[PDB]
């Protein structure tokens, strides 16, 4: 019964932290406030979350798992990969705009000077690999280059999302994030060089 | 002179003791000016790195424009530019890393000063001009915007390389960015290409 109590405890702390973060702000909330609200010692909080940002990483990982489930659903339903890609970025744009205040500090964590944490943030938010899954069918379909691995390409697109999202959130919140993300997709997918227009129907 | 004596004294201290460990006070003393005078020239320490970054960029800009005269093909100029950036980044990683972090400083006023000091995107956009002229680049995006996007990729790759994974061949990584963005991930196999 310890495992169940342990999972119950982590989940409660998470909820407590998220409620406080949403109502008072991430930076303004302290481990002491979180512990109090979750009904646990501060020491217990740190045992589950050694540093506050780890709560946000937990959150982003949850958001990503929901998107993954969505993408896999659309692909199994037979949606064209390119459309799923365009769908994913549209949903990423919407979710990022909606959760801007919590995602911003989480975004900086990927740029943490301490390599151990930058690494932990990275592994917790594998958007790059989700994108790779969508590219996979395109490759077997023969329309995708093969001089670069699916992994490195997906990672490149995920890096663009990250930079555009961070910049939008930190510096230009008034701009159209959906359009900006569509641009990254269109450029990396089709390239800057013009392509052949099909014979009209 | 002075702005020059300060900048040189700063770089020398950075070289001998490290950027992070060097202080405004020490720079002031080595440049022979008061802390007040130092700050008129460089309100904050990273501003010295921006100045450094600007001069390195000017040099690249120099090289670029002089290769375009010489008739070198646009795409070949781009490949050269990134081969030079790759080596340069590797050689001066210790000073460039704190400069890269400054580009994403939370203070919008500082992030903008950093962006404006390091206009790589615009340089890429000048090299692209002949392609635009040839009529071979899409028109739903400006050259400036496409250029900014390829510079962003450089930034991303370079910051990752210099801070977390120096093991990667930086030149091949930049060559990858150029290739994906210029050509796209979808293949180009038309039996009858234009031109
Ligand atoms: C060895 C060392 C080598 C060099 C080492 C260094 C290499 C650095 C590589 C790059 C690294 C980075 O950039 S990372 C930097 C992250 N930092 C930031 O983003 C800080 C941002 N700070 C700022 O102050 C912002 O940039 C502002 C406030 C100036 C706003 O930007 P901005 O308005 O886009 O600036 P500007 O230069 O005029 O850009 C004009 C383009 O944006 C478009 N644009 C603007 N608003 C809109 C809009 N609402 N809808 C559509 N389009 C818009 C314009 O139409 C035009 O696109 P179009 O019509 O032409 O298509
Ligand atoms: C809802 C909001 C969501 C939000 C979601 C937001 C997602 C944002 C994602 C991007 C965010 C950023 O990273 S922005 C950039 C700055 N931040 C960061 O980079 C985050 C921290 N970064 C890191 O820790 C590192 O860069 C890693 C972990 C990403 C690097 O991965 P790594 O394996 O160490 O390094 P990698 O590049 O893979 O190199 C492996 C070497 O071995 C080869 N190799 C090949 N296969 C393998 C293999 N299976 N295992 C190991 N190695 C392999 C590779 O070719 C390479 O050779 P060779 O290369 O020697 O030839």
- Quick one: residue A200, left, alpha or beta (phi over 0 = left, psi -120 to 50 = alpha)? beta
Closest by Cα among A54, A34, A144 to B183: A144
Give the domain extent around B128: 1-195
Closest by Cα among B57, B64, B82 to B178: B82
* B83-92, Cβ contacts within 8 angstroms, sequence gap of 24 or more: B83/B171, B83/B174, B83/B175, B84/B60, B85/B60, B85/B154, B85/B158, B85/B174, B86/B170, B86/B171, B86/B173, B86/B174, B87/B171, B88/B56, B89/B158, B89/B161, B89/B162, B89/B170, B90/B170, B92/B56
Q: Do A138 and B190 touch (CB under 8 A)?
A: no
B107 vs B154: CA distance, rounded Å: 22
Yes or no: say if A93 and A178 are a contact pair by the CB < 8 Å rule.
yes
A66 vs A81: CA distance, rounded Å: 18
A126 vs A120: CA distance, rounded Å: 11
* B87 and chain A in contact, CB less than 8 A: no
B87 vs B169: CA distance, rounded Å: 10
Write b or e for each residue in B139-165: b if 16 or more Cβ atoms lie within 10 A of its Cβ, otherwise e: eebebeebbbbbbbbbbbbbbbbbbbe
Q: Which two tokens stand for residue B105?
A: 């400083």
Scan for tokens 């943490």, then name that residue. Answer: A112
- Chain B hits for A144, CB-CB cut-off 8 Å, are 185-187
Q: Which two tokens stand for residue A200?
A: 């009209």
First to last CA, chain B: 55
CA angle A27, A32, A38 (to 5 degrees): 100
Scan for tokens 């129907």, then name that residue. Answer: A201
Taking the CB of residue A157, how many other CB atoms lie within 10 A of it?
26
Yes or no: say if A18 and A59 are a contact pair by the CB < 8 Å rule.
yes
Q: Which two tokens stand for residue A99?
A: 């959760």
What single string gives the DSSP state of each residue in chain B? --HHHHHHHHHHHHHHH-TTT--HHHHHHHHTS-HHHHHHH-SSTHHHHHHHHHHHHHHHHHHHHHHHHTT--HHHHHHHHHHHHHHHHHHTHHHHHHHHHHHT-SSHHHHHHHHHH--HHHHHHHHHHHHHHHT-B-SSS-HHHHHHHHHHHHHHHHHHHHHT-TTS-HHHHHHHHHHHHHH-SB----SS---
A163 vs A169: CA distance, rounded Å: 10
Number of domains composing chain A = 1
Q: Do B185 and A144 touch (CB under 8 A)?
A: yes
Closest-CA distance of chain A to residue B171, Å:
15
d(CA B168, ligand 2 centre) in Å: 10
Half-sphere CA count of B140, side-chain side, radius 13 A: 13
Closest-CA distance of chain A to residue B58, Å:
25
Taking the CB of residue B121, how many other CB atoms lie within 10 A of it?
20
Scan for tokens 């959760």, then name that residue. Answer: A99
Measured CA distances, B17 to A95, A162, B8, B13 (Å): 45, 34, 14, 6
Name the method of structure determination: X-ray
CATH of the domain at B37: 1.10.357.10
Q: What 3 state SS string does chain A have?
A: CHHHHHHHHHHHHHHHHHHHHHHHCCCCCCHHHHHHHHCCCHHHHHHHCCCCHHHHHHHHHHHHHHHHHHHHHHHHCCCCHHHHHHHHHHHHHHHHHHCHHHHHHHHHHCCCCCHHHHHHHHHHCCHHHHHHHHHHHHHHCCCECCCCCHHHHHHHHHHHHHHHHHHHHHCCCCCCHHHHHHHHHHHHHHCCECCCCCCCC
Taking the CB of residue B4, how many other CB atoms lie within 10 A of it?
10
> What backbone torsions phi and psi does residue B40 show, to the nearest 5 degrees?
-70, -35
> What backbone torsions phi and psi does residue B186 show, to the nearest 5 degrees?
-70, 140
A40 vs A9: CA distance, rounded Å: 9
First to last CA, chain A: 66
Taking the CB of residue B124, how many other CB atoms lie within 10 A of it?
25
Is the CB of B103 within 6 Å of ligand 1? Answer: yes
A81 vs A86: CA distance, rounded Å: 9
């Amino acid at each position: 019964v310890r495992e169940y109590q342990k999972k119950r405890r982590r989940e409660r702390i998470f909820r407590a932290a998220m409620e406080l973060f949403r109502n008072r702000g991430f930076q303004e909330t302290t481990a002491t406030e979180i512990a109090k609200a979750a009904h646990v010692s501060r020491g217990t909080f740190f045992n589950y979350y050694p540093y506050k940002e780890a709560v946000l990483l937990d959150y982003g990982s949850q958001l990503l798992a929901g998107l993954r489930e969505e993408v896999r659903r659309l692909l199994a339903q037979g949606r064209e990969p390119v459309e799923v890609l365009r769908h994913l970025f549209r949903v990423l744009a919407e979710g990022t705009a909606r959760e801007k205040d919590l995602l911003l500090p989480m975004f900086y964590e990927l740029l943490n000077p301490d390599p151990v944490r930058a690494r932990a943030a990275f592994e917790a938010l594998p958007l790059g690999d989700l994108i790779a899954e969508i590219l996979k069918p395109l490759r077997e379909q023969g329309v995708l280059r093969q001089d670069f691995s699916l992994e490195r390409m997906g990672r490149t697109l995920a890096d663009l999302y990250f930079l555009s999202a961070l910049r939008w959130a930190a510096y230009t919140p008034g701009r159209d994030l959906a359009e900006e993300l569509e641009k990254n997709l269109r450029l990396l997918l089709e390239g800057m060089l013009v392509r052949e227009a099909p014979a009209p129907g």
